Enzyme design. Structure first.
Site, PDB file in Angstrom:
ATOM      1  N   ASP A 186     -21.009 -15.204 -15.648  1.00  0.00           N
ATOM      2  CA  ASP A 186     -20.684 -15.826 -16.932  1.00  0.00           C
ATOM      3  C   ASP A 186     -20.554 -17.343 -16.774  1.00  0.00           C
ATOM      4  O   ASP A 186     -19.870 -17.818 -15.865  1.00  0.00           O
ATOM      5  CB  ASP A 186     -19.385 -15.182 -17.456  1.00  0.00           C
ATOM      6  CG  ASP A 186     -19.094 -15.460 -18.945  1.00  0.00           C
ATOM      7  OD1 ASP A 186     -20.014 -15.652 -19.779  1.00  0.00           O
ATOM      8  OD2 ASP A 186     -17.878 -15.489 -19.283  1.00  0.00           O
ATOM      9  N   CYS A 220     -26.066 -10.800 -23.326  1.00  0.00           N
ATOM     10  CA  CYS A 220     -25.099 -11.141 -22.285  1.00  0.00           C
ATOM     11  C   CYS A 220     -23.774 -10.789 -22.938  1.00  0.00           C
ATOM     12  O   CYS A 220     -23.652  -9.713 -23.532  1.00  0.00           O
ATOM     13  CB  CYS A 220     -25.217 -12.591 -21.792  1.00  0.00           C
ATOM     14  SG  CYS A 220     -25.399 -13.844 -23.044  1.00  0.00           S
ATOM     15  N   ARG A 226     -26.432 -17.036 -21.180  1.00  0.00           N
ATOM     16  CA  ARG A 226     -27.426 -16.437 -20.307  1.00  0.00           C
ATOM     17  C   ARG A 226     -28.605 -15.931 -21.118  1.00  0.00           C
ATOM     18  O   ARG A 226     -29.757 -16.190 -20.756  1.00  0.00           O
ATOM     19  CB  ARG A 226     -26.789 -15.331 -19.473  1.00  0.00           C
ATOM     20  CG  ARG A 226     -25.701 -15.921 -18.470  1.00  0.00           C
ATOM     21  CD  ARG A 226     -24.886 -14.807 -17.891  1.00  0.00           C
ATOM     22  NE  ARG A 226     -23.834 -14.343 -18.796  1.00  0.00           N
ATOM     23  CZ  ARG A 226     -22.923 -13.465 -18.411  1.00  0.00           C
ATOM     24  NH1 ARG A 226     -22.967 -12.918 -17.200  1.00  0.00           N
ATOM     25  NH2 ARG A 226     -21.958 -13.107 -19.251  1.00  0.00           N
TER      26      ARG A 226
END
Ligand SMILES: O=C1CN(c2c(O)cc(-c3c[nH]c(C(=O)NC4CCCCCC4)n3)cc2F)S(=O)(=O)N1
Length: 283
Positions: A186, A220, A226
């Site tokens: 993350d 994500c 992402r």
């Protein structure tokens, strides 16, 4: 030069590295991204359908759940016409929106789900477990779907699950390719450009982004960092097929008109240049 289609991007990359301008370039993108209406996301009845109050689909590009009393899901249709590419970017589903996620996948004729997060990251749940891990079927009676695991292909940095999605009411079934990249932190970057590119090439080689399928669903946790990084790299590499020097900053700004906040850190931006360059070299 002739055998170097990545040349102009690579020259840009070295130029930005030398002057250490990744953070100012990222701020330019943030400053030049403009807001668009997102009223439906903020309706009181949709409060528990949003993972993060800060991350909302725009009204003009949200994916609608058809034939539903409430048609709202936090998912955006991101299309890049110059590339003939379309994607659905969405948050990691919540326990109460896993049924809506699969209804969307069904209605949009999606063949592939690209998942870029882990269920648990840094002692926090980032996504509900929306597909089964063993042979027990997962039932979503709210929307009339069941999901069965068909197979699992575990590699060092990612796993591919083949899922059987069944419309309970209609009896139709469809096989979904669930491409799970498990080593992308993350707000971070993948383990390497090479590992990311193998994953992306596997998604491409599968046939799941072919025009006769609906758009792939990319997610994500919030569906912007992402997910936006993955989308930008694939889109730019497709744009490179036409042979013109591409403006990565502009491509990303254009994608950001469909969903806010795509690519979340200067390093994710830098990684994007690196994977486009190394990806063009691989091809
Ligand atoms: O690289 C990436 C990064 N991602 C990502 C993400 O994980 C989360 C968020 C986000 C946006 N608002 C909030 C938020 O309010 N958190 C609160 C904070 C204080 C209270 C306790 C915890 C809950 N979190 C934004 C993202 F971009 S991504 O999009 O998944 N991909």
């Amino acid at each position: 030069p002739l055998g170097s289609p990545w040349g102009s991007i690579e020259r840009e990359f070295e130029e930005l590295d030398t002057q250490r301008r990744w953070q100012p370039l990222y701020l330019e993108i943030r400053n030049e991204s403009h807001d668009y209406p997102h009223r439906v996301a903020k309706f009181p009845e949709n409060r528990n359908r949003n993972r993060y109050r800060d991350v909302s689909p725009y009204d003009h590009s949200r994916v609608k759940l058809q034939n539903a009393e409430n048609d709202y899901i936090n998912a955006s249709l991101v299309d890049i016409e110059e590339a003939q590419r379309s994607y659905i970017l969405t948050q990691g589903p919540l326990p109460n929106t896993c049924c809506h996620f699969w209804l969307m996948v069904w209605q949009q004729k999606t063949k592939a789900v690209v998942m870029l997060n882990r269920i648990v990251e840094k002692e926090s749940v980032k996504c509900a477990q929306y597909w089964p891990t063993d042979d027990q079927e997962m039932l979503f009676k709210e929307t009339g779907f069941s999901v069965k695991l068909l197979s699992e292909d575990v590699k060092s940095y990612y796993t591919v699950h083949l899922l059987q999605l069944e419309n309970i009411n209609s009896g139709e079934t469809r096989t979904i390719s669930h491409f799970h990249y498990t080593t992308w932190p993350d707000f971070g970057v993948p383990e390497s450009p090479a590992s990311f590119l193998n994953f992306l090439f596997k998604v491409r080689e599968s046939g799941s982004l072919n025009p006769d399928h609906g758009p792939a669903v990319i997610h994500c946790s919030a569906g912007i960092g992402r997910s936006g990084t993955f989308s930008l790299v694939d889109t730019c590499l497709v744009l490179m097929e036409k042979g013109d020097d591409i403006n990565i900053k502009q491509v990303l700004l254009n994608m950001r008109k469909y969903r806010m906040g795509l690519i979340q850190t200067p390093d994710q931006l830098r990684f994007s240049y690196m994977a486009i360059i190394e990806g063009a070299k691989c091809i």
